[PDB]
Amino acid sequence: MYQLHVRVVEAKELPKMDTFGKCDAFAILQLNSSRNIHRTKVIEKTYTPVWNEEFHIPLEDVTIDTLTVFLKDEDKGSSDDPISLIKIPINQFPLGEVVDKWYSLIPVKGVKKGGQIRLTIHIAPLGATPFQKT
Ligand SMILES: [Ca+2]
Ligand SMILES: [Ca+2]
């Protein structure tokens, strides 16, 4: 059994998602199509949010699982404003290695640019120290 440790560090180059504001960005992580969703806090009115939030996701398959990362703009009614997403196959992360990288997000219809998001990702055996080389 293995754990997917993900630090959602920061994002930049976000689009303007509010006509008279900037962007109220938060990220959502989803392994495969799981109902167990994880989300960051919102950083209000910035194009360069820094969250530095950590999540720990049990893996079903260290090669076939996929991590989907969604970026959204929190809005003032009952719904939020999708920005972009990226689909990250997990097989590219060597087992036990901590990988810190930027990812170009794919914007949704009607959004000019998707931004970039920095993620630190570590596939580690259950019980090993998260975000430390195994
Ligand atoms: Ca908006
Ligand atoms: Ca907003």
**CA of residue 81 to ligand 1 center, whole Å:** 5
| CA dist., res. 117 & res. 28, Å (int) | 12
Round to whole Å and give the CA distance between 42 and 88. Answer: 22
Nearest ligand to the CA of 22 is: 2
Nearest listed ligand to the Cα of residue 44? 2
3-state SS class at 90: helix
Kindly list the domain boundaries of the chain, sorted by start residue: 2-125
Among 39, 123, 26, which Cα is nearest to 83's?
A: 26
Contact 119, 8 (CB under 8 A): yes
CA distance 31 to 56: 11
Technique used by the depositors: X-ray
Please give the resolution of this entry in Å, rounded to 1 decimal. Answer: 1.5
Q: How far is the CA of 55 from the centre of ligand 1 (A)?
A: 26
Please tell me the distance from the alpha carbon of residue 84 to that of residue 129, in angstroms, as a whole number: 31
Q: Which CATH class is domain 2-125?
A: mainly beta
Tokens of 128: 């090993």
Q: How far apart are the first and last CA of the chain?
A: 14
Retrieve residue 123's tokens.
Answer: 């596939």
Q: Which two tokens stand for residue 113?
A: 């640019």
